[PDB]
């Protein structure tokens, strides 16, 4: 009854998140409207405002120590600028194009943000950065499944590319290791390539750091590269990556193997510019890729199948599995890690726990109901101290401080953007009931918070709004009986 | 001695009462175990225990379990500890 | 994958010790265990209906071996099968008579 | 056809003991 | 408390508990009702439970 | 007893070696058959007192080589492959002027 | 049995043997460092040494595409054949199912 | 009333006897009739309300 | 070991001693109520053979 | 706890492709393994085994046991090497019972290590002196272990 | 914890099944974090009890 | 419980007989017990002993 | 380095039985078993109770709940 | 520390502090909390290693003694309250509300 | 009344058994020496729980 919707005016839009506001007929009862009275050329000035506003869109230089366990946002034009590769495995599940692009600023997020602030001028802070990593080349971030691992790694490229630092960002390592098809390297004997993962890597890395790679002069790169009519020979590292991925099929298959090897040769010789290398899921690069070696009868050559002493068409067999060290992309990475002549590259990476569940027995997964349909088929245990040369950082689930800030952003800004209950706010409970309940269902696990936020729709045994509407209808009928 | 409970053997039968209906009758018999622990082997008690079968109840039987200690000799001359032969046995043996 | 099963003699190792295959041959010597030669290393299937404790028909022994087509024609089934001597069939042959008095005495001897 | 049906060649047929038709290709008669 | 375990230890527990059922030494050189020298068990069988 | 627990795998349970003799019809011959199977099992277990060559070996589930050691698999013959890849690049750029797509079978993969 | 164990290809024991034999002919180290003691690929299965045998597969399509016949006739057990069927389960003496033999 | 059958044993509690004994305590009009009801209330096991 | 016609006349005659159960239940043995006929088929195998460590 | 399907659907009249109703022998069920026992048309020994309930249940019990085996072997990041008793570490100098013989044994409760010995996995870089004494060249590098007491980024310094 | 595994993994992270476990706590006006609970299954053992009848 | 420390026995300790299942305890009594036309004494009394 | 393998096997064989029962001794042996025990009890107790103490086993065990701890009156 | 199971010793005089007679509060082997005479050490000893001073041979409860009952010449009449057989509703202590 | 119910007396006996449990005193007990599966396997997962 008390609407206050016609008297509401729209605030002036300054950023992308302020323009994500829905019409006032949607979120009128979802986010209630209060009125404040200012003293402006008259004692009453009725100003109808929202109780909840969007969290502020801040550049990473404006983020501070007081913003720990708070919520901030990024622009959509800042999203397309700093992320041409994409985001992590499950980061973009909370950002449709109507929603603002929010991020939680944790305390481990503040440690990495001040780290890249010292990476930006590393030559004067070299003894500081060596004591932070304990002499290692970088950090590896490990924890349980669904925590802030890939959600932190996309923040690091937001921290570094806003500080105009050249970044190698692998948004998910399962395109390289668990890819579509594997091809041997053209110029590297005994090495292999992921060609579809490489053309997408050589495309988006050129667009991301075009301001820095155009100033990158080619030091160790042969100038007799094969070049068709109308194309210019590359003189920059931006021109080298555009020589690789921009081609016609099947000439793009062998061009990336030349380009990736000469990219890793050019990066390993640069000792002056800081190059942050961020990899989502380094544990996939630390063990065997899911490809296997081909059978030697395929390359040997046969005249017939009946008399050749082979059974390649009769019975399948499991060859030894190809490790990730035999890939041309990871060969250049492991060259810069193990060789101590590069105090310039900082490998702030993480692991992934996106594997399928297996708890003693296993039937067949139902094709309709399978949350792990695009999950990894590995089942292998991983220890980041023993299987990587980086410093392990252990992050757990949320505590109740940042879980409250993350759930306030999910519920309120979803209904403010026209994606939540809206007019059906009276059927769902209040925020203190939802904070108490989802914290039980998730255990403050960050993927479980997002998952049970969508599973708030199918709650059956919540009786808060039933008893409240019974009390208010009882209070109404006695109020009119008092007036009678 | 103390009496120990044992679950009854019960086995049911499913047969026609005629394709009209099915009858469900079960054979069943109940068990009680009596545990007698003596700290010596006496044949006078074993004789008395075996003769309880002659005055049992109607349609009631019994069986006897006897767990006794007995000295066993491992003769290391009849069964010696020898080195393995020069030509060892294979799976073909 | 496809490999050859290896064996190290105790005279070859720098610290000699009894291996696990000649202990298997010593175990097969005592209890007379048949060693099937063409038993495949890849086919080790557990009876998960019985062995797993989170199933309804949980028995700690494998009640059925996971082999399709384990019939009477194979001689390995014949060697490990129980002969029907002094079984319930031997009770059925001597007791199930149309006249129970023809199993406890002769009629001429009783008359 | 369970494992290796693709390895059957035309030399595995006993073509000397039958007579086939010239139009369709099927066997017309059998030899004693 | 509360009881949370790895499942393969639970898989090892439930199989070892049933296979070691009759792996018991009854006549032990010990104290009273557990310890003895000979153990007699008479299994009585009848058609009715009160019999 | 380490040799005795391996030679009698399921016959030993909860510190008690149990032998169930079911070979013969009468129990008197099964006591005799059970006695000689106990003495044959004890005599082969007594070989561990002869020397260390009859001590049963410990089965350790030792891990695969770790990701730190697997990182060095890229640098196996690093200077030889980097020398090799330069002439393989020169073999590649001369063969690109002849055909559109040049496979690694035409560069370094020996097939025949 | 149902898997007819294939022929032993010469260099397929690990990734280094395949790289040194077929991919890179000038590979220095031939195979992975093998210990002096005996490795057990099949575990806890004791296999006859000197016999070419195959490990259990790790992918699902290798278990699917392998020439494994399915059960067609009536299944048989070596001691559950005196008892004819689960409906015709024969018991000689009516002992309890929890009867422990001394 | 002392319950004997398990149907009325499922409706027996010393805290529920507190309400029934207080209703008889308020039904009384004089203290000599009330102190006799109170003494057997605390003689029996009854939670005092 | 009789037919269905002989089993009813032994029940209607009163010779054998059988207890009648409701025709939609599984009787009284807990092994039959748990898994059915196949679970009791495995329990007799566990009693007759698999409880003995064979030599 | 596993949420996959284990039992086979029972036999009734021929199902159709509807809502909450799949045909009885479809390519979606059990990963397409029902093609061995399916009929396309809407020889007596080759027709009746497709319709027997005990026969089709046994084949799914084999296929689920194959899926249980391949996931237990993909979990293995180790291998079993017979190491003699003298060169073995201190926690393996005890009498180890076999599988399903005793209670699941803790490793060493005196040193506050309560874990099963049968799931103990040792790193290969620890036993280079035992597994490879004949090389003498240290074929595997030593494992770089991080200093837990060093002031790093995780300890706000 | 239900049979050694946490409640988010037993009931397969389903909110409409796990909220019935919270229902003894909220109707009592009690906080669930002040109590530890372990539930032992004594009925028919199944690989997944993710249903509303088990909840 | 223990009889030597029992003297005032604890009766009806809320032990749930509905968690356990013994539902089939149906009993069949003879027809016409309180009927005025059916006599109390008779040869139909022998039907009370039949199982 | 202290005793033989036959002594260590005989010592472990006594202490592994179901109930370890103490043997009866002779009178001159009981005097020898007690007098050495009196001499060896000085090194096992702390120095607060070496000279004057209450009982022979007082301070040999780390934690023992005595009945005399509460009634100090 | 070298003993695997336990070591028994000589029987010393002691008093019983507590004895959980319930099978759930005291499983097998049963323990009884005793306090010895010489040093007053409170220990939980097994029930097999205790000895009581019996009063008779055939007794189920051997520690307590026999008691003589009172004799009545005309013992055929004797009045017992059916409602209060143990005289519960009468109070020997006088209350302040009996005025 | 009694102090505990039938399922309450079952699990309160299991806690007293695990409080006095020693694995060297489970020499020849058989399956009676298995020390309360719920609390024994919880101690074996202490490397993963870490309260
Ligand atoms: N906006 C925002 N979302 C977060 C943050 N931390 C966690 N999340 C949410 O938590 C979920 C988990 O994100 P991921 O980092 O991809 O989870 P993970 O640890 O990488 O999971 P695995 O890849 O399986 O190992 C995401 O879907 C996010 O919605 C954060 O700091 N900011
Ligand atoms: Mg991730």
- What SS3 string covers A165-233? CEEEEECCHHHCCCCCCCEECCCCCCCEECHHHHHHHHHHHHHHCHHHHCCCECCCCCCCCCCCCCCCC
A94 known member of a binding site: yes
Residue J30: both structure tokens together: 């059990």
For residue A29, give Cα distances in angstroms to A3, A48, A98, A415, J125: 8, 14, 20, 10, 64
Q: How many angstroms separate the CA atoms of I50 and I42, rounded?
A: 10
Sheet holding J121-122, edge to edge: G39-40, J78-83, F58-63, J121-122
Alpha helices, DSSP H only, in G9-90?
Answer: 15-18, 60-65
Q: How many angstroms separate the CA atoms of I32 and B27, rounded?
A: 14
Q: What ligand has the least distance to the C-alpha of A146?
A: 1
**CB interface of B with E, residues 16-35, below 8 Å:** 28-35
Q: How many angstroms separate the CA atoms of G28 and G35, rounded?
A: 19
* B39 within 8 A of E36, measured Cβ to Cβ: yes
Q: How many angstroms separate the CA atoms of J100 and C59, rounded?
A: 13
Work out the widest C-alpha separation in chain F, in whole angstroms.
93
Query: Does the beta carbon of C42 lie under 8 angstroms from any beta carbon of chain G?
Result: yes
Dihedral sign (CA H10, H14, H15, H17): positive
* A352 within 8 A of A378, measured Cβ to Cβ: no
Q: How many angstroms separate the CA atoms of H12 and H7, rounded?
A: 10
CA of A57 to the centre of ligand 1 (A): 20
DSSP secondary structure letters along A238-275: HHHHHHHHSS-TTHHHHHHHHHHHHHHHHHHH--SS-E
Q: How many angstroms separate the CA atoms of A475 and E10, rounded?
A: 57
Q: How many angstroms separate the CA atoms of C47 and C50, rounded?
A: 6
CA N43: distance to chain centroid?
Answer: 19
* Residue whose pair of structure tokens reads 């810069």 in the numeric block: A336
* Residue whose pair of structure tokens reads 């009766």 in the numeric block: L11
Q: How many angstroms separate the CA atoms of F32 and F23, rounded?
A: 10
Q: How many angstroms separate the CA atoms of B73 and N10, rounded?
A: 36
Nearest residue on chain B to I16, alpha-carbon basis: B27
* B45 within 8 A of B65, measured Cβ to Cβ: no
What angle (nearest 5°) sits at the alpha carbon of residue I3, between those of residues I2 and I8?
Answer: 95
CA N50: distance to chain centroid?
Answer: 14
Residues of G in contact with D6 (CB under 8 A): none
Q: Which residues line ligand 1 (CB under 6 A)?
A: A 88-91, 93-94, 102-104, 106, 145-151, 352-354, 446-447, 450
Nearest to C31 by CA among F55, F23, I48: F23
Test K4 with E5 for CB contact under 8 angstroms.
Answer: yes
Nearest to K48 by CA among A355, A443, J7: J7
J108: phi then psi, degrees, rounded to nearest 5: -150, 100
Chains that touch O (3 or more CB pairs under 8 A): E, F, J, K, L, N
* C40 within 8 A of C49, measured Cβ to Cβ: no
Between helix A400-416 and helix A446-454 the angle, nearest 10°, is: 30
- Give the residue from E1, E4, E12 with the most K CB atoms within 10 Å of its CB, the best one to mutate: E4
Q: What ligand has the least distance to the C-alpha of A446?
A: 1
A345 known member of a binding site: no
Atom of ligand 1 nearest to the CA of A354: 24
Between helix A150-161 and helix A107-119 the angle, nearest 10°, is: 30
Instruction: State the number of CA atoms in the 13 A half-sphere of A403 facing the CB.
Output: 26
CB-based touch D/B (3+ pairs, under 8 A): no
**CB atoms inside a 10 Å sphere around CB F29:** 12
* A134 within 8 A of J152, measured Cβ to Cβ: yes
Sheet holding A166-170, edge to edge: A166-170, A275-279, A345-350, A138-142, A391-394
Atom of ligand 1 nearest to the CA of A93: 27
E strand or H helix that includes residue E40: strand E38-46
Nearest residue on chain A to K5, alpha-carbon basis: A359
Return all residues near J134 (Cβ < 8 A) that are at least 6 apart. C14, G36
Nearest to A166 by CA among A266, A89, A99: A266
O26: phi then psi, degrees, rounded to nearest 5: -100, 40
Q: Roughly how many angstroms between the first and final C-alpha of chain N, as a whole number?
A: 69
Residue G50: both structure tokens together: 């000197």
**CB atoms inside a 10 Å sphere around CB H19:** 10
Q: How many angstroms separate the CA atoms of E21 and F10, rounded?
A: 12
Dihedral sign (CA D14, D15, D20, D25): positive
CB-based touch F/O (3+ pairs, under 8 A): yes
Residues in a beta bridge with B4: B33
Q: How many angstroms separate the CA atoms of F40 and E3, rounded?
A: 45
Burial A427-465 (b: 16+ CB within 10 A, else e): ebbeeeebbbbbbbbbebbbbbbbbbbebbeebeebeee
CA F67: distance to chain centroid?
Answer: 21
Test I47 with G95 for CB contact under 8 angstroms.
Answer: yes
Nearest residue on chain A to F79, alpha-carbon basis: A335
DSSP secondary structure letters along N32-86: EEEEESSS-BEEEEEGGG-----S-SS-SS-SSPP-PPP--TTTT-----SS-TT
For residue L4, give Cα distances in angstroms to N28, N31, N50, N69, O6: 19, 18, 19, 21, 21
A182 known member of a binding site: no
Q: How many angstroms separate the CA atoms of G3 and F100, rounded?
A: 44
Q: How many angstroms separate the CA atoms of A49 and A9, rounded?
A: 8
E strand or H helix that includes residue A139: strand A138-142
DSSP secondary structure letters along A46-70: EEEEES--PPPB--TTT--GGGTTE
A447, A448, A451: which to mutate for ligand 1, most atoms within 8 A of CB?
Answer: A447
Q: How many angstroms separate the CA atoms of N43 and N46, rounded?
A: 10
Nearest to G95 by CA among I50, B27, B9: B9
Burial A188-214 (b: 16+ CB within 10 A, else e): bbbbbbbbbbbbbbbbbbbebbeebbe
A207 known member of a binding site: no
CB-based touch B/E (3+ pairs, under 8 A): yes
Residue A223: both structure tokens together: 């100038």
Atom of ligand 1 nearest to the CA of A350: 20
Nearest to G1 by CA among G89, G63, G67: G67
CA H35: distance to chain centroid?
Answer: 13
Task: Name the experimental technique.
Answer: cryo-EM
**CB interface of G with E, residues 81-100, below 8 Å:** 94, 99-100
Residues of B in contact with C16 (CB under 8 A): none
Strands F58-63 and J121-122: parallel
A316: phi then psi, degrees, rounded to nearest 5: -80, 155
Return all residues near N89 (Cβ < 8 A) that are at least 6 apart. H40, H43, N83
For residue F102, give Cα distances in angstroms to A253, D3, F95, F107: 9, 36, 7, 8
Q: How many angstroms separate the CA atoms of E6 and A359, rounded?
A: 9
Q: How many angstroms separate the CA atoms of N90 and B87, rounded?
A: 98
Closest chain K C-alpha to A397 CA, distance in angstroms = 14
CA F71: distance to chain centroid?
Answer: 24
Closest chain A C-alpha to G78 CA, distance in angstroms = 27
Residue J101: both structure tokens together: 């013989």
* F17 within 8 A of F4, measured Cβ to Cβ: yes
Strands J113-116 and I19-20: unpaired
Alpha helices, DSSP H only, in chain G?
Answer: 15-18, 60-65
A91 known member of a binding site: yes
Q: Roughly how many angstroms between the first and final C-alpha of chain H, as a whole number?
A: 19
Test A358 with J71 for CB contact under 8 angstroms.
Answer: yes
DSSP secondary structure letters along J91-153: GGSS----TTTSS--EEEGGGTEEEEGGG-EE-TTTSHHHH-TTT-S-SSPPP----TTS--G
Q: How many angstroms separate the CA atoms of D21 and B4, rounded?
A: 87
Dihedral sign (CA C76, C77, C81, C85): negative
Residues of F in contact with A234 (CB under 8 A): none
Residues in a beta bridge with A348: A139
Atom of ligand 1 nearest to the CA of A150: 15
Residue I23: both structure tokens together: 């025709």
Q: How many angstroms separate the CA atoms of F45 and B79, rounded?
A: 11
Residues in a beta bridge with B26: B12, I19
J32: left (phi over 0), alpha (psi -120 to 50) or beta: left
D18: phi then psi, degrees, rounded to nearest 5: -135, 170
Q: What HEC string does chain H produce?
A: CCCCCHHHHCCCCCCHHHHHHHHHHHHCCCHHHHHHHHHHHHHCCCCCC
Helix (H, G, I), strand (E, B) or coil at N14: strand
Q: Which residue has the least CA distance to atom 7 on ligand 1?
A: A148
- Is residue B6 exposed (0-12), middle (13-18) or buried (19+ Cβ within 10 Å)? buried
Whether the bond into C64 is cis, omega within 30 of 0: no
* Residue whose pair of structure tokens reads 């990593």 in the numeric block: A133
Q: How many angstroms separate the CA atoms of A137 and A268, rounded?
A: 13
Q: What ligand has the least distance to the C-alpha of A94?
A: 1
Residues of C in contact with K44 (CB under 8 A): 56
Q: Which of B6, B29, B67 sits opposite G94 (nearest CB)?
A: B29
Q: How many angstroms separate the CA atoms of O28 and O18, rounded?
A: 17
| DSSP assigned state of N95 | P
Strands A33-37 and J78-83: unpaired
Residues of O in contact with K40 (CB under 8 A): 38
CA of A351 to the centre of ligand 2 (A): 7
């Amino acid at each position: 009854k008390k609407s206050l919707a016609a008297m509401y005016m729209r605030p002036p839009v300054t950023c992308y998140t302020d323009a994500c506001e829905a019409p006032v007929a949607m979120w009128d009862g979802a986010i209630p409207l209060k009125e404040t009275r200012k003293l402006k050329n008259g004692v009453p000035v009725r100003t109808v405002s929202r109780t909840y506003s969007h969290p502020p869109q801040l550049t990473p230089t404006q983020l501070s120590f007081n913003d720990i366990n708070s919520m901030y946002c990024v622009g959509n034009d800042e999203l397309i600028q700093f992320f041409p590769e994409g985001l992590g495995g499950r980061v973009f599940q909370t950002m449709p194009p109507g929603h603002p692009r929010g991020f939680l600023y944790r305390k481990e997020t503040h440690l990495l943000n001040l780290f890249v602030d010292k990476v930006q001028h590393w030559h004067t802070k070299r003894s500081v950065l060596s004591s932070l990593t304990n002499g290692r080349t970088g950090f590896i971030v490990d924890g349980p499944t669904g925590c802030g691992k890939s959600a932190l790694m996309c923040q690091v490229v937001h921290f570094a590319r806003s500080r105009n630092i050249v970044t190698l960002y692998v948004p998910d390592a399962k395109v390289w290791t668990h890819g579509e098809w594997c091809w041997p390297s053209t110029i590297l004997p005994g090495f292999f390539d992921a060609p579809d993962a490489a053309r997408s890597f050589l495309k988006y890395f050129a667009v991301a750091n075009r301001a820095t790679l155009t100033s990158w002069k080619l030091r160790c790169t042969p100038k007799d590269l094969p070049t068709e009519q109308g194309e210019r020979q590359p003189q920059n590292l931006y021109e080298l990556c555009e020589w690789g991925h921009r081609a016609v099929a099947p000439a793009s298959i062998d061009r990336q193997s030349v380009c990736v090897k000469f990219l890793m040769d050019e990066l390993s010789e640069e000792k002056k510019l800081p190059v942050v290398i961020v990899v989502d899921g380094w544990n996939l690069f630390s063990h065997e890729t899911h490809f296997r070696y081909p059978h030697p009868d395929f390359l040997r050559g046969l005249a017939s199948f009946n008399e050749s002493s082979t059974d390649i068409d009769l019975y399948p067999q499991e060859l030894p599995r190809i490790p990730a060290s035999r890939l041309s992309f990871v060969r250049g990475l492991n060259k810069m890690i193990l060789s101590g002549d590069d105090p310039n590259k900082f490998f702030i990476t993480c692991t992934t726990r996106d594997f399928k569940p297996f708890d003693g027995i296993s039937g067949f997964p139902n094709v309709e109901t399978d949350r792990f349909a695009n999950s990894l088929d590995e089942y292998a245990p991983y220890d980041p101290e023993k299987d990587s040369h980086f410093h392990p950082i252990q992050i757990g689930n949320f505590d109740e401080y940042e879980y409250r800030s993350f759930l306030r952003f999910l519920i309120n800004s979803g209904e403010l953007a026209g994606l939540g209950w809206g007019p059906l706010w009276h059927a769902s409970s209040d925020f203190e009931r939802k904070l108490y309940k989802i914290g039980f269902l998730s255990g403050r696990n960050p993927q479980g918070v997002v998952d049970h936020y969508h599973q708030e729709l199918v709650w059956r045994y919540d009786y808060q709004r039933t008893r409240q509407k019974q009390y208010l209808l009882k209070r109404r009928m006695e109020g009119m009986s008092r007036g009678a | 001695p103390h009496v120990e409970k044992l679950e009854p053997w019960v086995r049911m039968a499913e047969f026609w009462t005629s394709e009209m209906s099915t009858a469900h009758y079960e054979f069943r018999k109940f068990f009680r175990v009596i545990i007698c622990k003596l700290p010596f082997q006496s044949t006078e008690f074993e004789k008395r225990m075996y003769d309880i079968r002659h005055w049992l109840h109607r349609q009631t039987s019994c069986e006897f379990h006897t767990i006794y200690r007995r000295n066993v000799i491992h003769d290391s001359a009849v069964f010696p500890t020898e080195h393995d032969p020069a030509t060892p046995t294979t799976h073909e043996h | 994958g496809v490999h050859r099963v290896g064996y190290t003699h105790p005279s070859t190792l720098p610290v000699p010790c009894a291996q696990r295959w000649d202990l298997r041959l010593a175990r097969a010597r005592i209890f007379q265990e048949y060693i099937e030669e063409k038993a495949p290393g890849a086919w080790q299937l557990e009876d998960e209906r019985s062995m797993s404790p989170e199933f309804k028909t949980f028995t700690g022994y494998p009640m059925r071996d996971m082999r399709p087509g384990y019939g009477q024609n194979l001689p390995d089934y014949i060697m490990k099968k129980r002969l029907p001597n002094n079984t319930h069939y031997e009770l059925f042959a001597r007791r199930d008579i149309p006249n129970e008095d023809n199993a406890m005495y002769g009629k001429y001897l009783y008359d | 056809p369970e494992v290796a049906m693709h390895r059957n060649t035309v030399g595995l047929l006993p073509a000397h003991m039958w007579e086939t038709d010239k139009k369709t290709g099927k066997v017309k008669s059998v030899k004693d | 408390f509360p009881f949370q375990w790895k499942t393969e230890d639970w898989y090892e527990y439930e199989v070892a508990k049933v296979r070691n059922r009759r792996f018991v030494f009854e006549n032990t050189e010990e104290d009273g009702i557990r310890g003895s020298e000979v153990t007699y068990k008479i299994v009585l069988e009848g058609f009715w439970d009160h019999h | 007893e380490r040799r005795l627990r391996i030679l009698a795998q399921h016959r030993v349970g909860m510190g008690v070696l149990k032998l169930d003799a079911d070979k013969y019809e009468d129990q008197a011959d099964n006591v005799t058959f059970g006695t000689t199977k106990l003495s044959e099992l004890l005599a082969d277990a007594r070989k561990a007192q002869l020397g260390e060559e009859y001590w049963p070996s410990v089965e350790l589930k030792v891990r695969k080589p770790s990701g730190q050691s697997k990182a060095h698999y890229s640098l196996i013959d690093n200077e030889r492959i980097e020398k090799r890849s330069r002439e393989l690049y020169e073999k590649y750029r001369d063969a690109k002027k002849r055909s559109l797509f040049v496979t690694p079978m035409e560069t370094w993969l020996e097939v025949k | 049995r149902f898997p007819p164990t294939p022929s032993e290809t010469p260099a397929t024991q690990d990734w280094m043997a395949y790289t040194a034999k077929y991919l890179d002919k000038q590979f220095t180290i031939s195979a992975e460092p093998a210990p002096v003691y005996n490795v057990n690929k099949l575990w806890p299965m004791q296999q006859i040494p000197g016999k070419v045998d195959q490990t259990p597969f790790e992918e699902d399509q290798t278990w699917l595409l392998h020439s494994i016949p399915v059960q067609q006739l009536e299944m048989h057990h070596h001691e559950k054949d005196l008892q004819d069927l689960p409906f015709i389960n024969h018991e000689q003496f009516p002992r309890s199912l929890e009867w422990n033999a001394p | 009333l002392e319950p004997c059958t398990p149907r009325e044993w499922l409706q027996f509690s010393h805290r529920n006897l507190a309400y029934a004994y207080n209703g008889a305590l308020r039904a009384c009009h004089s203290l000599p009739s009330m102190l006799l009801l109170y003494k057997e209330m605390k003689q029996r096991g009854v939670k005092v309300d | 070991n009789v037919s269905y016609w002989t089993m009813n006349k032994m029940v209607r005659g009163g010779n054998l001693l059988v207890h009648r159960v409701h025709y939609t239940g599984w009787g009284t043995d807990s092994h039959l109520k748990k898994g059915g006929w196949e679970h009791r088929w495995n329990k007799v195998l566990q009693r007759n053979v698999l409880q003995y460590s064979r030599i | 706890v596993s949420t996959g399907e284990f039992d086979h659907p029972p036999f009734q009249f021929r199902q159709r492709h509807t809502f909450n109703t799949t045909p009885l022998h479809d390519a979606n069920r059990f990963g397409g393994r029902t093609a061995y026992l399916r009929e396309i048309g809407p020889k007596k020994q080759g027709r009746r085994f497709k319709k027997d309930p005990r026969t089709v249940q046994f084949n799914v019990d084999v296929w689920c046991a194959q899926q249980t085996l391949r996931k237990r072997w993909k979990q293995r990041d180790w291998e079993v090497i017979e190491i003699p008793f003298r060169l073995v570490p201190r926690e393996q100098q005890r009498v180890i019972p076999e599988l399903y013989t005793d209670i699941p044994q803790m490793t060493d409760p005196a040193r506050n290590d309560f874990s099963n010995i049968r799931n103990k996995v040792y790193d290969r870089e620890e036993l280079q002196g035992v597994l490879f004494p004949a090389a003498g060249a240290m074929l595997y590098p030593p494992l770089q272990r991080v200093d837990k007491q060093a002031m790093t980024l995780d300890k706000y310094l | 914890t239900v049979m050694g595994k946490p409640l988010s993994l037993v009931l397969d992270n389903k909110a409409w099944l796990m909220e019935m476990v919270l229902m003894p706590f909220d109707e009592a006006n009690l906080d669930y974090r002040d109590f530890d609970a372990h539930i032992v299954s004594e009925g028919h053992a199944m690989p997944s009890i993710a249903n509303e009848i088990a909840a | 419980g223990d009889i030597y420390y029992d003297d005032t026995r604890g009766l009806h300790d809320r032990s749930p007989t509905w968690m356990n299942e013994v539902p089939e305890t149906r009993y069949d009594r003879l027809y016409g017990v309180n009927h005025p036309d059916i006599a109390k004494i008779g040869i139909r009394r022998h039907l009370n002993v039949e199982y | 380095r202290a005793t033989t393998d036959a002594i260590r096997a005989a010592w472990e064989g006594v202490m592994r039985e179901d109930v370890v029962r103490l043997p009866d001794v002779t009178g001159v042996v009981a005097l020898y078993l007690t007098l050495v025990c009196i001499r060896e009890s000085g090194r096992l107790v702390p120095e607060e109770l070496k000279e004057l103490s209450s009982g022979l086993e007082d301070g040999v065990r780390p934690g023992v709940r005595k009945l005399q701890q509460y009634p100090l009156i | 520390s070298s003993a695997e199971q336990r070591i028994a010793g000589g029987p010393q005089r002691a008093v019983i502090i507590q004895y959980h007679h319930q099978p759930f509060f005291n499983p097998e082997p049963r323990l009884v909390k005793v306090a010895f005479q010489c040093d007053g050490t409170i220990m939980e000893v097994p029930i097999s290693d205790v000895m009581i001073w019996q009063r008779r041979y055939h007794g189920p409860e051997r520690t307590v003694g026999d008691e003589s009952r009172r004799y009545n010449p005309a013992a055929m009449r004797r009045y017992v309250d059916v409602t209060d057989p143990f005289n519960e509703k009468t109070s020997n202590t006088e209350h302040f509300l009996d005025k | 009344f009694n102090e505990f119910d039938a399922k309450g007396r079952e699990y309160v006996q299991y806690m007293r058994e695990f409080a006095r449990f020693d694995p060297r005193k489970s020499r020849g007990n058989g399956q009676k020496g298995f020390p309360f599966r719920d609390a024994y396997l919880t101690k074996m997962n202490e490397a993963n729980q870490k309260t």
